[PDB]
Design an enzyme around this catalytic site. Structure first.
Site, PDB file in Angstrom:
ATOM      1  N   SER A  42      41.177  45.504  46.457  1.00  0.00           N
ATOM      2  CA  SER A  42      41.679  44.410  47.273  1.00  0.00           C
ATOM      3  C   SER A  42      40.833  44.218  48.551  1.00  0.00           C
ATOM      4  O   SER A  42      39.632  43.980  48.470  1.00  0.00           O
ATOM      5  CB  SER A  42      43.142  44.598  47.476  1.00  0.00           C
ATOM      6  OG  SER A  42      43.695  43.349  47.884  1.00  0.00           O
ATOM      7  N   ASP A 101      46.821  37.420  38.964  1.00  0.00           N
ATOM      8  CA  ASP A 101      46.472  37.783  40.332  1.00  0.00           C
ATOM      9  C   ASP A 101      45.836  36.539  40.946  1.00  0.00           C
ATOM     10  O   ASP A 101      44.912  35.973  40.363  1.00  0.00           O
ATOM     11  CB  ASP A 101      45.507  38.970  40.354  1.00  0.00           C
ATOM     12  CG  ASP A 101      44.973  39.447  41.704  1.00  0.00           C
ATOM     13  OD1 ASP A 101      45.237  38.804  42.717  1.00  0.00           O
ATOM     14  OD2 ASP A 101      44.304  40.508  41.716  1.00  0.00           O
ATOM     15  N   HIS A 120      47.833  42.037  40.614  1.00  0.00           N
ATOM     16  CA  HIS A 120      47.141  42.632  41.743  1.00  0.00           C
ATOM     17  C   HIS A 120      47.799  43.969  42.106  1.00  0.00           C
ATOM     18  O   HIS A 120      49.019  44.111  42.040  1.00  0.00           O
ATOM     19  CB  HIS A 120      47.270  41.691  42.942  1.00  0.00           C
ATOM     20  CG  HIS A 120      46.359  42.050  44.049  1.00  0.00           C
ATOM     21  ND1 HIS A 120      45.033  41.681  44.037  1.00  0.00           N
ATOM     22  CD2 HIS A 120      46.581  42.718  45.199  1.00  0.00           C
ATOM     23  CE1 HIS A 120      44.459  42.131  45.141  1.00  0.00           C
ATOM     24  NE2 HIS A 120      45.376  42.769  45.862  1.00  0.00           N
TER      25      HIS A 120
END
Ligand SMILES: COC(=O)c1ccccc1C(=O)OC
Length: 298
Positions: free
Chosen positions: A148, A242, A272
């Protein structure tokens, strides 16, 4: 492809000051590790002197060393949340499954530190790791990795590496944020309800960036960089459901077309964050992908 059944269950069972929000994020990570305990692993805590101050690190030592470069890992959390403890479950497994020494980095969080402070810190830590590597019996070239926001940092460090005289053998990007300017289809289609949401992303940007103009800065949005030739070999792992999917896959395609050895893997049915959620078997599958990829570096 349908949403993974366990993912679907997780989302269905999901129900503040900054300090409280950070503690909440930490508590969730603890709960997941209680549900699926990490492998035991030898670790050593340390501190690296960076150009913006001391940065705590934790070095993970594999039972059996099988990979010739150190990994430098940068945790996610929107630039605002997370720490070495929140990501221990992932890093312990990277360490033991790859058989690599891993440096997990506690970079400075926003809003207390703003863009581009953690970028600088992450470079400095990478440089330290390259200098230490021979004394660990390793090659000086490092592998950078992150999930991320951490995948953002890894991608940016990689783009800066030549200019910073930093030897980097590979980059491992786990559902990275890479383009803060452009809307993509996935960013619209999965904007709400899949753990990482639109409003949160906005708020994270408000904490991290100095002004709205920073979205177009290449150290914030590395997908905007026009020249990707000669960057380090890249593993780009995305989740099907995501909002960040499309920018991650587009960057993998751009790297590939720029002659960078690239492996692009979408985990179907996933969301995610899945590589720090050990309730999903896909987390360990993705870690096996890492090991397989890194086998091909040397
Ligand atoms: C204002 O800070 C930055 O954005 C920056 C930092 C170091 C080098 C270059 C830059 C830059 O692109 O703008 C001055």
């Amino acid at each position: 492809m349908p949403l993974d059944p366990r993912v679907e269950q997780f989302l269905a069972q999901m129900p503040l000051s900054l300090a409280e929000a950070r503690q909440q994020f930490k508590q969730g990570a603890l709960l997941l590790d209680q549900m699926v305990p990490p492998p035991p692993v030898d670790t050593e805590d340390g501190t690296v002197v960076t150009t913006h101050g001391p940065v705590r690190i934790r070095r993970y030592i594999p039972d059996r060393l099988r990979f010739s470069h150190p990994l430098v890992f940068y945790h996610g959390g929107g630039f605002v949340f997370g720490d070495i403890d929140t990501h221990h479950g992932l890093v312990a497994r990277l360490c033991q499954t790859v058989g690599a020494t891993v440096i997990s980095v506690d970079y400075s969080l926003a809003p207390e530190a703003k863009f581009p402070v953690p970028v600088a810190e992450c470079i400095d830590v990478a440089r330290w790791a390259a200098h230490e590597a021979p004394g660990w019996g390793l090659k000086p070239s490092i592998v950078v990795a992150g999930d991320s926001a951490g995948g953002n940092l890894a991608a940016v460090v990689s783009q800066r590496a030549k200019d910073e005289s930093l030897p980097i053998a590979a980059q491992l990007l786990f559902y990275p944020a890479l383009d803060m300017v452009h809307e993509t289809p996935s960013k619209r289609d999965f904007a709400r309800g899949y753990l990482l949401e639109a409003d949160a992303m906005q708020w994270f940007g408000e904490q991290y960036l100095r002004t709205p103009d920073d979205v177009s800065h290449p150290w914030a949005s590395p997908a905007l960089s026009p020249d990707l030739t000669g960057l380090p070999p890249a593993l780009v792992i995305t989740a099907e459901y995501d909002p960040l999917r499309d920018e991650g896959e587009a960057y993998a395609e751009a790297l590939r077309a720029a002659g960078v050895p690239t492996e692009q893997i979408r985990f179907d049915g996933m969301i995610h964050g899945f590589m720090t959620m050990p309730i999903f078997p896909q987390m360990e599958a993705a870690i096996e992908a890492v090991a397989r990829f890194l086998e091909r570096i040397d």
